[PDB]
Design a binder for this molecule. Structure first.
Ligand SMILES: Nc1ncnc2c1ncn2[C@@H]1O[C@H](COP(=O)(O)OP(=O)(O)OC[C@H]2O[C@H](O)[C@H](O)[C@@H]2O)[C@@H](O)[C@H]1O
Length: 253
């Protein structure tokens, strides 16, 4: 049988096209300053942090460090990707494959460009069925998921180095659209993290700086709470450390 929650989530899945960029900037603008935003950096998975936020989050959203060209990443390379962790534990794949999200994949593929495009998919009330360990949750917990691909900085470096000056501007403006989806959908709690910093090989300090700059500027006080849940099993914890250091000025009471 189709799992509970899936049908309603798929039918409510929505595409944000690049032409919505100003609508997202306006939504951020209208919401800036609403709260004293609290921030934190944790070493949790995206869904551990979401499940810990749920009970006291009015509208909870999380970022999917998405593939531009295949729902769920096509399930290639293994279980170190965040997006495959999301599709393993939740109904997200059933949303990403929806007919209305298909332009995101078709256009990004048609771009023949490792910066990808400014399409974003919004997936309402995605049910989380399992925890990090794969055990069945007694009750699925719903989360709203924003799907956006960071620029593929590894592929720029190796395949089209004349786009190298475009990686950070791309990352910066698309991070702006992610927050703008969240503000347009009037989300209070956001689970962010090291978007683009593994398979896509973006620089962790650069990505956390870009989220810092936005949460101190255009998106300042637009959200109740922001969690940078940064899973990092590398020996020196360089990703988690880069986020912790770069986001120490924001994560203050
Ligand atoms: N469940 C997790 N939760 C939180 N953080 C995680 C998790 N898993 C990894 N991280 C950390 O977050 C960092 C980034 O996670 P990555 O998945 O590489 O994001 P990208 O945007 O650079 O690659 C996206 C591509 O890879 C996928 O296949 C997509 O389909 C795309 O094709 C990791 O280094 C971890 O430290």
């Amino acid at each position: 049988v189709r799992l509970p929650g899936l049908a309603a989530m798929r039918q409510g899945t929505r595409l944000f096209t690049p032409e919505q960029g100003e609508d997202l900037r306006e939504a951020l603008r209208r919401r800036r300053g609403s709260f004293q935003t609290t921030c934190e950096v944790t070493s949790e998975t995206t869904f551990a942090a979401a499940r810990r936020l749920r009970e006291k989050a009015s509208a909870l959203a999380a970022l999917n460090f998405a593939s531009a060209k295949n729902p769920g990443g096509g399930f290639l390379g293994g279980a170190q990707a965040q997006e495959e962790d999301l599709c393993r534990g939740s109904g997200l794949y059933f949303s990403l494959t929806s007919p209305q999200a298909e332009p995101y994949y078709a256009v990004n593929r048609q771009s023949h460009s490792a910066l990808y495009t400014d399409h974003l998919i919004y997936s309402p009330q995605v049910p989380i069925f399992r925890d990090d360990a794969g055990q069945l949750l007694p009750a699925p917990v719903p989360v709203n998921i924003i799907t956006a691909p960071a620029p593929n900085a590894g592929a720029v470096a190796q395949s089209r180095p004349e786009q190298l000056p475009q990686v950070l501007p791309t990352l910066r403006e698309r991070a702006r659209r992610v927050l703008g989806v969240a503000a347009w959908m009037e989300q209070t709690h956001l689970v962010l993290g090291a978007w683009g910093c593994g398979v896509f090989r973006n620089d962790p300090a650069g990505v956390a700086r870009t989220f810092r700059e936005l949460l101190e500027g255009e998106a300042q006080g637009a959200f109740e709470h922001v969690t940078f849940a940064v899973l990092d099993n590398h020996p020196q914890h360089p990703t988690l450390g880069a986020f912790r250091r770069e986001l120490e000025s924001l994560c203050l009471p």
